[PDB]
Amino acid sequence: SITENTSWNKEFSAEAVNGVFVLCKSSSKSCATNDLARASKEYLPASTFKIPNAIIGLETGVIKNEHQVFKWDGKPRAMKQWERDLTLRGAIQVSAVPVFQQIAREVGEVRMQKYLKKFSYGNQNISGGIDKFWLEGQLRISAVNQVEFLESLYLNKLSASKENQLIVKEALVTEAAPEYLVHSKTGFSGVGTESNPGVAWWVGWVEKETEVYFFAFNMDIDNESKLPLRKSIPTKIMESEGIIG
Amino acid sequence: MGSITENTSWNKEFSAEAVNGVFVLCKSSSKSCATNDLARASKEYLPASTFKIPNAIIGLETGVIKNEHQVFKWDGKPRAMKQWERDLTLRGAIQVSAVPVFQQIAREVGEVRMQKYLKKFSYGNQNISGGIDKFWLEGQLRISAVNQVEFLESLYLNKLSASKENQLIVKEALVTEAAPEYLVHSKTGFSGVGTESNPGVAWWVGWVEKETEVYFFAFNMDIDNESKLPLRKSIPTKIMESEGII
Ligand code: NA
């Protein structure tokens, strides 16, 4: 059950953002959102796909262990931040595409399809190129599906060892306070094309006292200058709900 | 673990605050440690709350703790700190240093199993005399800063005599700072203000993951007044900041 919450519209209006926030307390049984329709609309996952990709890499042994170092071969990569040896956490934090492209190639299309089916990950469409289906392909997932997937990860209920789920969760910690703990991941497909904007994401969960909140945000984006809104709008809302800050 | 050297240059941060203490910092790649005081780095002190690291692992290994989602229910009876009068997750109990929670865990573990695991973990002087629910607070258990970084390195590598899953559970509970460049796991300790000419001890121990490097650290200091407690984090933080780790 998904319920609409008009109070959050102001945080989108202020910035002229077309997007959706989904927030679920305790579980995905009851989620609130500003837009029922968009909450379930499916978009390219972009970098949010690093989460299942890392779990699958570990499950298949492609990622040998949580202390795996992904070495840089010295060839040019799109960002200087990617031109170095990286740990799993490091590659997730700087969204090092080529590391995850190689993981996906070594996983291969058969195993990748199997695990996305097991994870109920979006439309599970990996066709068109095994190293780019989540970047420019036909794979799509909704904000509602992201919170279901993240809840499963939080509960160690995905079709993967508890160890591997714990390894990926540690790699996703983005804020640690005495009061609460934030696991999150951003994504950005790009600026899109004429009359067809890209998508920007922020998904994760907040552990606070004995409660947990799952969240997923996405928005239309046609200019990189708008990227900070993918964190600030959901942060504003969760602040106004008394969850963080 | 492989070598240790004395670094006089860190004494600056201790003298500035009139602190008698030690910092041990070890770089995992080079298997090399540095400290401001080799003698104090080997002196053994009550672990106090730093003992919540082994105690939680042992609690999980023995099944006394079910998993990271176990909620430690408050029975409603008063507690010294007001922060303890609520339900707590494992991370919550570790983060607020909830003494009664871990006293009950130690009782359920029992002396025989507690002794066995501290032997397996090579944890300090392995003396748990003094009562099963207070040996680490006011009994005879002592551990040095060098021993602390040896133990934390084992945990980081999942090389303690415990399941990898249980070591991972305790590690996630120990995360205290997450930045895009680095991740900090840490734990504080404080035994009390001590007695005339016999101060208590305050601790800060943990590790830092940065780029492909790992830094293990252990800090302790004499403390005779609660107002000095913030120095157990500020002195090591300033040292690690000056080393470029932050
Ligand atoms: Na590249």
Numbering used by the authors:
A (entry chain A): 21 to 265
B (entry chain B): 19 to 264
Which text from the study accompanies this structure?
Samples of OXA-10, treated with tazobactam or tazobactam in combination with BME (with full conversion to the respective −18- and +60-Da species verified by SPE-MS) were crystallized. Three high-resolution structures with two molecules in the asymmetric unit (ASU) were obtained, each using similar crystallization conditions. Evidence for cross-linking was observed in both OXA-10 chains. In chain A, clear and continuous electron density for both the Lal cross-link 10 and some unreacted carbamylated lysine was observed. The quality of the electron density map was overall less clear in chain B, though the mFo-DFc polder OMIT map indicates partial cross-linking. However, no clear density for the remaining carbamylated lysine was apparent in chain B, which was therefore not included in the final model. By contrast, with the D(2S)-stereochemistry observed on BME addition to Dha 9, the new chiral center formed by reaction of Lys70 with Dha 9 has, at least predominantly, the L(2S)-stereochemistry. The combined SPE-MS (including derivatization trials with BME), LC-MS/MS, and crystallographic results imply initial formation of a Dha residue 9, which reacts with Nε-amine of a Lys side chain to give the cross-linked Lal species 10. To date Lal 10 has rarely been identified in natural protein structures under biological conditions, with the spirochaete flagella hook protein being a notable example, and it has not previously been described with a β-lactamase. From the inhibition perspective, the Dha 9 and Lal cross-linked 10 species (which cannot be directly distinguished by intact protein MS) are of particular interest as they are the only modifications we observed leading to apparently irreversible inactivation of both class A and D SBLs.
